[PDB]
Swiss-Prot record:
Phenotype for Y110C: In sporadic cancers; somatic mutation
Residues of the full protein shown: 96 to 291 of 393
Effect of M65T: In a sporadic cancer; somatic mutation
Outcome following mutation: G184W: In sporadic cancers; somatic mutation
Name used for this protein in its record: Cellular tumor antigen p53
Reported effect, S88A: Abolishes strongly phosphorylation
Effect of P128L: In sporadic cancers; somatic mutation
Effect noted on mutating T189E: Inhibits strongly its transcriptional activity
Result of changing P96R: In sporadic cancers; somatic mutation
Result when mutating T45N: In a sporadic cancer; somatic mutation
Annotated consequence of substituting T135N: In sporadic cancers; somatic mutation
Amino acid sequence: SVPSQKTYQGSYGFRLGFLHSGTAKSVTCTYSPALNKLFCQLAKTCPVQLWVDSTPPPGTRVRAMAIYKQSQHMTEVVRRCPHHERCSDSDGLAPPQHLIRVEGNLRAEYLDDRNTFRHSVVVPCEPPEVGSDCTTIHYNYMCYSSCMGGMNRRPILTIITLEDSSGNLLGRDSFEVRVCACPGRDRRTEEENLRK
Ligand SMILES: CCCSc1cc(C(=O)O)c(O)c(I)c1-n1cccc1
Ligand SMILES: [Zn+2]
């Protein structure tokens, strides 16, 4: 099967937000609204904002999962490549096979789905800190888009779901991801291609 990617704000008005990091050669993570695409370096912090119109109940959680964007690959589980799954870069919580990690949250849970074999990482929802209007999760992507035997140059989407305590769907958003050495240059190139 294939997870849904349909945007769904739901009862709480759930949606993502991204910082405006620019496209300088030194940028490590940058988001293109025109492409709905995040460009990031390997294993670097990717801040993703969560926004709601109203407060969800205690026990609500936020899950992240990657799928291949192209239909002919969408049934294949997105996983780390044969090199990176063996490079012993564990943080003590993420299984070495998982592409997406959450940084700096000891309550993150990593799921290997018993039926679909897909990987995901889920955290409890926490309200914004005093003085802030949104909550930020820091993700890391642990393989390059180009990794042979893994993503192998195939584009991926990240699907972010807001879920109740049973795992039922409350909201959904998504974005394409390219993990690459020079995200600023690649964002500029792809935005230019889109304009042309
Ligand atoms: C379940 C505990 C509360 S979760 C929550 C509350 C508020 C709020 O304003 O009260 C908010 O703005 C956000 I963004 C979140 N939130 C955190 C992750 C996803 C949504
Ligand atoms: Zn890899």
